Amino acid sequence: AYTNSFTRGVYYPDKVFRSSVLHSTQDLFLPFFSNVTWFHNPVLPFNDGVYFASTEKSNIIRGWIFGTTLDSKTQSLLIVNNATNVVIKVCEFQFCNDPFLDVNCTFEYVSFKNLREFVFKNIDGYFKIYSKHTPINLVRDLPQGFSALEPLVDLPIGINITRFQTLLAYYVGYLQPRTFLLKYNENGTITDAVDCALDPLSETKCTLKSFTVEKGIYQTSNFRVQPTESIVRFPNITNLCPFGEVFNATRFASVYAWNRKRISNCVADYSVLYNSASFSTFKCYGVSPTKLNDLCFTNVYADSFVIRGDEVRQIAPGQTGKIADYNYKLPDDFTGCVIAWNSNNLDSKVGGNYNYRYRKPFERDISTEIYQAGSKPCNGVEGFNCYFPLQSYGFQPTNGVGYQPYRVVVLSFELLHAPATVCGPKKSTNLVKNKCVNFNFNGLT
Amino acid sequence: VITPGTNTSNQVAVLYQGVNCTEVPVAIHADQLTPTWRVYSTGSNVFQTRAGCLIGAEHVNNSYECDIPIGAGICASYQTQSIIAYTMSLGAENSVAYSNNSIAIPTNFTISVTTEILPVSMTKTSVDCTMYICGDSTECSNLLLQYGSFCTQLNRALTGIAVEQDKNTQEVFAQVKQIYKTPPIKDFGGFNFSQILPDPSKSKRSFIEDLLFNKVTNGLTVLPPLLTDEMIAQYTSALLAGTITSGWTFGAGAALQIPFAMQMAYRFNGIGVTQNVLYENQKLIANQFNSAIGKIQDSLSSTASALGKLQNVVNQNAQALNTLVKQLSSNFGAISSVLNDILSRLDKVEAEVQIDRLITGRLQSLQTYVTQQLIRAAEIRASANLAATKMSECVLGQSKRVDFCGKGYHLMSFPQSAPHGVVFLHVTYVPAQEKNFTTAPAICHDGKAHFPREGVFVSNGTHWFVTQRNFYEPQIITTDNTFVSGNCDVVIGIVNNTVYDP
Amino acid sequence: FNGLTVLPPLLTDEMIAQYTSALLAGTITSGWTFGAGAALQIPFAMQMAYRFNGIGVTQNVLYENQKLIANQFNSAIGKIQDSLSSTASALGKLQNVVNQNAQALNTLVKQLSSNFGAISSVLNDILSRLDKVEAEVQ
């Protein structure tokens, strides 16, 4: 059952004096001319905040209860105007739906031809109360016209209200986020208001910041047609990518002569990698790792090697040194992920797995030819100025972690340019035309 | 949103610019996702136009004058009531009664008085850009030093504007070499200037200057004009008193006294009306002029909307300064817009990385304000140069430039001062009550062809006369009103008559 | 279509054509008089005698040469057609106003392609590729 709200339910939004000014604000308010629920008790949803009002003089409407359950399980609001005072408490109360007669406690406080009206909201755990009292004669509907509700209570009580009820002629409506123009008079009091969305004239009043507007034509808004649906158009590839074969291989190559596997014409679920607790690092650069399952690519390259844990700092964009410029260097704009784990449980020997060894962007020299590091022609033999280029990793079973073996896979991603070729697990929709739509073609949103 | 004005009615019509009505009430208006622009499939009626989809208005086929413009020849108005929309009419259509031997000549005239209003000066303004940007916080003031000349070239730009506004005000009003002042007697031949001369009881402005002065309504500083409103009112007094007592003569050497009726006889002789027409009609002319000044008092009392060109200068300065002050509250990406929050909450490297956003935003905001004032001041200077020209030509003289000094033939004009501007009362002669006549280019007598020395030949259908071009005054066709050239052979449309010899 | 919009003028070209007709028809039938007040009709050759006194030529010089003067004028208007039909570059003062506004808009639109130091000129790339805390820097 329902009634018209007219222009009721505005309250002073702040403790700020303003003189003779048409101030403007955006906040939770009861929208003008909205439908208000009508009563002659039930438990009601609280939503984002409440307007409540009643015709009264008996004080049969003694107060309210608010919370999630309204009984036993939690600290919960009890409010009672007991004719001696407004009494408030927030206890873990043990009372049913009607504890009144026939007609923990983290906080507590003590203060028809008539109507009283109230607004209740909670923000940041501060529960807040606004009020007004009036005489009336037309009690047969909510009173037409305007007067401002004003604050009473503002308390950090923290309770998550979702339900409430009355305690034993009243009406209930809900606050909504809206923009208003508020007429402060030459005495510091609100005396009128405009609900800016109500009609194009209210948008015009709010555009001009005035209650009167001249004859004319005024721009208030921009119109845009909205998407009616969403579309996914993707490759219809059925094959699934070889990541087990990439990551769980018997032995990775040396860092000086690194391996690379192409991944192509398959669907890739990177959550299989990204969710895995196994990886000591998952450093992604030109793309965020959370997004990988929603993108699409022309190719993916898994470069891979085993290397000593200390040198991971050179496996980054634009770096230099023996691990980078003499083994494997990334470009400055690397679009990809560095994925690695400590592999001491497999790559470590009983004293030194010396088969793993160390010495441009995606450069590689497989040669072990002597550094002719001076004037003497070394002719394949070491000496002064004459050195074998590949130092050997001493991977024993109990090295310090910087000295342990790590297994590395670096994924480099080829962006969409040519057609979709490695792609996320997205499912293609039907195609719609001539309507406005959202669309996604191979990740092109 | 097209509106009758809330004074008159609460109905509105709405135009969706460039959009097609097959989309409009089927979109973010009506039957789709619809934030703010709440639903109606038709608000009363829907009507496509070249300007866009028009909703709520009523299409009409009568072409009225344009009340509210829409675009592409469409206008809207509130009428028997609804908002009607129509293709506008440019004006009533008049087929002029032209034929090769017919002429119309006025038999009577009306003096008219018309008001023209021009801006002359802006609010003189200057800003302490270090106080605006940093509010006396030392850490911010030290960061700002890295930007060099910016908070000094801005002051130099605003100083150029502030000095120019005194120059504009001086160039318009200071045309007069001495403070000429009015005689104690008021025998100006029947004319009554008492509404535009000084009121000595008040500041000593005229009555009409007090209407004008009534009707017009941080780190920042506002500076006074060089000349006070009391000084400007003395120059308008002097310019007016010179014009009344001495005609244009005070505009070229020293003022020469002349009786005002004889000065008006020269003004008439300047527009090709023979001066006897003035002295024979002097009481009627004075009654028309005295009446016309009264209508100006009513016009400026009846609405405040007349001074829109002056009022807009005051509004544009307020609009810009409020915007410049509000721009202090913006974040520009910083963790707070209040500088002491950043300084209290963050370590010095984290604070300076944030504060340089507020400096960057506030500096980009302050350059934007100063650039608007530089452009707006050139627009006001173009008006002040026109006002100096209007005063030089119309007030100190009698300009023959058509429609320059009000509509109709120009006689004289009176300056009156107003806030941030000037108001001219242009006095003009309009010919009013014409008759048709038959006419001919020449008259043939004893074979000699006669032409009129001044004025034109006319006939009432039985007798021929000569008369002046701007006021019907028939006279006998004599050797003294005419001159000879050639004979009847050469001229097209010549007529026979006697030409009398005294 | 890129967030740009263009609006119609208030007066359409056939309304301007009514004003240029009306000013011309007033001038031909009534001299300057339709500026100062009502259009007083006057014979057009006699209006030209009033124009000649205005430049210090005694009006009999018009009437004694009226056929010649009409021929010189009728001939001169004909040459204006040939000048305008020949030489489009005579309208440089109007064409310039078109060409400047077209290049101003095309410069404003081409600037959407500039990176400004972000990962892409296409805003939906950043929003697709980067998670929100990283995207907001770009």
Added chain:
Amino acid sequence: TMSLGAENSVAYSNNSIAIPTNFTISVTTEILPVSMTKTSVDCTMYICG
């Protein structure tokens, strides 16, 4: 406080006129600016050196 100039009661009446009996030819200089210095800045060289 600045003076606006001398003040002067013109001797008006319904029957009095003043007529000049002599003249001065007078020469008045007027000066107007007409052009700026034609200037160009290569932004590629100004910004990036």
Added chain:
Amino acid sequence: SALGKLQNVVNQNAQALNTLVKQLSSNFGAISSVLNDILSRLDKVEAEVQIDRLITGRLQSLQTYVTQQLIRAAEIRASANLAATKMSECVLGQSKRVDFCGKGYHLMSFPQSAPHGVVFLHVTYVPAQEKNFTTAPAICHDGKAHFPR
């Protein structure tokens, strides 16, 4: 001091260029205002943040100069249109527009050239040595009113 109009047009362009040059030395929040310092002291990945501060400052400095020149050029264009008008109306003719071609009644004017400008000698007639007389608008003879031609 009479040529203050022309000397100002020389001064304003000098102050604009001196300001535009001095701004090259400002830091704009980079570690040096001299580009070769940053290029020689830093690796490119560090240098690019510093150089982008210098680009940002020097570009906004240059936009400010060009915007002032556009507005100043419109002021001088309006003066050149006025000068071109005075030349046609005062030199090639005899103007009757009060105070346009110099104060007094206008006879003629002579142009003379000047650096960045033009100078007119306006030649004018100014009346002097007035005498008072009694006057009347008209004279009556044989009961008929006579007016002067």
Added chain:
Amino acid sequence: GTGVLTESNKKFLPFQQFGRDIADTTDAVRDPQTLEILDITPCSFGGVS
């Protein structure tokens, strides 16, 4: 803030505690000990010429 504190007649409502200009600058406050209203007036500044 910084300013000249001054006695004032701006009649705040019982729950109102400070007040603002059109451009939102604070220009009045209640004293929380003696519950009357002060106007806040900015301390003077200007050009030395």
